[PDB]
Design a protein around this ligand. Sequence first.
Ligand code: NP7
Length: 302
Amino acid sequence: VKPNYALKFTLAGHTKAVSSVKFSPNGEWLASSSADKLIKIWGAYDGKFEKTISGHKLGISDVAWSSDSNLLVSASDDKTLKIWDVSSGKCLKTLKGHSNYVFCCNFNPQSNLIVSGSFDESVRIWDVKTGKCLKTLPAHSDPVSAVHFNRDGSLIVSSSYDGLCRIWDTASGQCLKTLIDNPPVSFVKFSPNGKYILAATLDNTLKLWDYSKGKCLKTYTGHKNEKYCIFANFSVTGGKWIVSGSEDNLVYIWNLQTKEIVQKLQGHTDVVISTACHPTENIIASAALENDKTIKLWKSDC
Ligand SMILES: CN1CCN(c2ccc([N+](=O)[O-])cc2NC(=O)c2ccccc2Cl)CC1
């Protein structure tokens, strides 16, 4: 079987490159961040604009939801993260401490912690309630491209231009594993069950790792990725897919097990830097850079 993703909605509004799209855990909303300094919220099913969230002084690289879908965290060129109340649009906390651009961010499942990665080569862990930086991890020797908590929050995975993926004990702050040619690692995330890590490198390659055995189980190629830190995803609502943007302006979909490309989605007119998979429906959101500036919503039967 192969999926049949068809374009349903194009969401215009951002005035610069869109950096990140994320579906809310409860499936109602899509949040988008942009170099235009703005966060925008959209209805996930009808693509209808909901609100604009403003406050950051410079462009925003990433946005992430709390488990209850009530809060957002953003990561900005202004060296801060901000925590937002989604319903009011209000900035609740500004997370200060990174010495350079913040590129990536995530809540833990418990949503009492935030993790962030910066151009400053560190990974920071923040208390959501107080805004205080609890730990600064000397994670990498180059900009940190991605940070993600595993399913139980006990682990953090980080990736960097230094060519390394690292797994950290959240509680102890110590490095549990280093996956080490080492081309820049531009993306990393845990699988839904926490057993695997999907990692992208800037040599046109995505890899699925069993990090406990430290072994590469699958490779996904055929797409273009040598410049931009492009977000990838596990698609699990229907067929079991791998989804990624690409520098040829397409969204690529692979069969996770066989590694064959099952679909390529055309429509965008610039690099697709971010994709998101809806938590319950077979819906993909994709976002493109400055020649495009739109988010597209795609729907499949499997
Ligand atoms: C969702 N992902 C999170 C991680 N991310 C990222 C990773 C690595 C580096 N870097 O080491 O250069 C830079 C960026 N950010 C930007 O490229 C960017 C920054 C501000 C505004 C717009 C954009 Cl697109 C891209 C989006």
